[PDB]
Enzyme design. Structure first.
Site, mmCIF file in Angstrom:
data_model
loop_
_atom_site.group_PDB
_atom_site.id
_atom_site.type_symbol
_atom_site.label_atom_id
_atom_site.label_comp_id
_atom_site.label_asym_id
_atom_site.label_seq_id
_atom_site.Cartn_x
_atom_site.Cartn_y
_atom_site.Cartn_z
ATOM 1 N N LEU A 21 -44.385 9.451 8.026
ATOM 2 C CA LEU A 21 -43.564 8.594 7.182
ATOM 3 C C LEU A 21 -44.420 7.390 5.871
ATOM 4 C CD1 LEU A 21 -40.393 8.735 8.012
ATOM 5 C CD2 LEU A 21 -41.342 8.954 9.885
ATOM 6 N N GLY A 22 -45.343 7.065 6.550
ATOM 7 C CA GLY A 22 -45.928 6.530 5.808
ATOM 8 C C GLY A 22 -47.378 5.637 5.995
ATOM 9 N N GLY A 27 -53.825 1.925 9.048
ATOM 10 C CA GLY A 27 -52.995 3.318 9.971
ATOM 11 C C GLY A 27 -51.806 3.910 9.326
ATOM 12 N N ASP A 134 -40.718 -11.863 4.793
ATOM 13 C CA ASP A 134 -40.296 -10.614 3.780
ATOM 14 C C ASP A 134 -39.077 -10.660 4.092
ATOM 15 O OD1 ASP A 134 -42.022 -7.545 2.862
ATOM 16 O OD2 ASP A 134 -40.253 -8.460 2.116
#
Ligand SMILES: Cc1ccc(NC(=O)c2ccc(CN3CCN(C)CC3)cc2)cc1Nc1nccc(-c2cccnc2)n1
Length: 268
Positions: A21-22, A27, A134
């Protein structure tokens, strides 16, 4: 300690991670399946980038901060490579989901309820004496029943620095960050309340980017002038006024997430 003594620890074997996914400079994040029957999101630590204990520090908060309005820790693998596992949400993030055709069908009533849930979990985070830093639609997950789970994906440290940037300041979403955080780097729960107000405009505008027609630099300039975002179309003046409470210049003048939760719940 044996993994079966623990409620979280699972043998790496239970994991078949399939899609990336990303990945970033600390990591990656994969989607995969736990014992084949459940699909999960898997955060992995890359060696060297940081302390194994610093990575786990996160997993550890998640154990302690369990709550219906928070993303629930599903499992953890301690040995290297270390994994933090949560369950996968087919509806994705709030900002994504809002833009989907089914997301766009949501009624103002359903939108306000989700806001209430987000406020609810933030109230818990406040009560447990943490902050978010955030808080925005991108760190909110939508569950199968269309309820909202507060997440922290570490979005900022997930972007790789390029040849053109060399900031050693702080990292934060310009358009969601209270001015005292922008100016003095002072992030508090009241700083999150500000973010929540901006988050509200996202909710009520199909996940539209805040401050439409302004660059992040422009935004900061206008903040210096006391400027506030214009009430989104169709957004109820009362809700907007609630937003305006989240954007009081002095952080202490801003509501609490309890008050926010409350107002939101009995809004109609
Ligand atoms: C795989 C993983 C590992 C760790 C976490 N952790 C958190 O989501 C989280 C939430 C709240 C806090 C509390 N924290 C207290 C301190 N302050 C400063 C910040 C907030 C910390 C971590 C989530 C996940 N889940 C995750 N991660 C990335 C993507 C997805 C995902 C799932 C489904 C569909 N699409 C994407 N799911």
């Amino acid at each position: 300690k044996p993994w079966w003594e623990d409620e979280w620890e699972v043998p790496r074997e239970t994991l078949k991670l399939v899609e990336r996914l990303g990945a970033g400079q600390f990591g990656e994040v994969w989607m995969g399946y736990y014992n084949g029957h459940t699909k999960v999101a898997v955060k992995s630590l890359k060696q060297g980038s940081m302390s194994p204990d610093a990575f786990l520090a996160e997993a550890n908060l998640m154990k302690q901060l369990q709550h219906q309005r928070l993303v629930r820790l599903y499992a953890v693998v301690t040995q290297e490579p270390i994994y933090i596992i949560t369950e996968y949400m087919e509806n994705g993030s709030l900002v994504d989901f809002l833009k989907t055709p089914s997301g766009i069908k949501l009624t103002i009533n359903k939108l306000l309820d989700m806001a209430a849930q987000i406020a609810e979990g933030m109230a818990f985070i406040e009560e447990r004496n943490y902050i978010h830093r955030d808080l925005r639609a991108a760190n909110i997950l939508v569950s199968d029943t269309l309820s909202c789970k507060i997440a922290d994906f570490g979005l900022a440290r997930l972007i790789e620095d390029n040849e053109y940037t060399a900031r050693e300041g702080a990292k934060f979403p310009i358009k969601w960050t209270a001015p005292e955080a922008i100016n003095y780097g002072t992030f508090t729960i009241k700083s999150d309340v500000w973010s929540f107000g901006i988050l509200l405009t996202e909710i009520v505008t199909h996940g539209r980017i805040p401050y439409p027609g302004m660059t992040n630099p422009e935004v900061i300039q206008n903040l210096e002038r006391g400027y506030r975002m214009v009430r989104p179309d169709n957004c109820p003046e009362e809700l907007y006024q609630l937003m305006r409470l989240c954007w009081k210049e002095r952080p202490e003048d801003r509501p609490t997430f309890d008050y926010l939760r409350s107002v939101l719940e009995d809004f109609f």
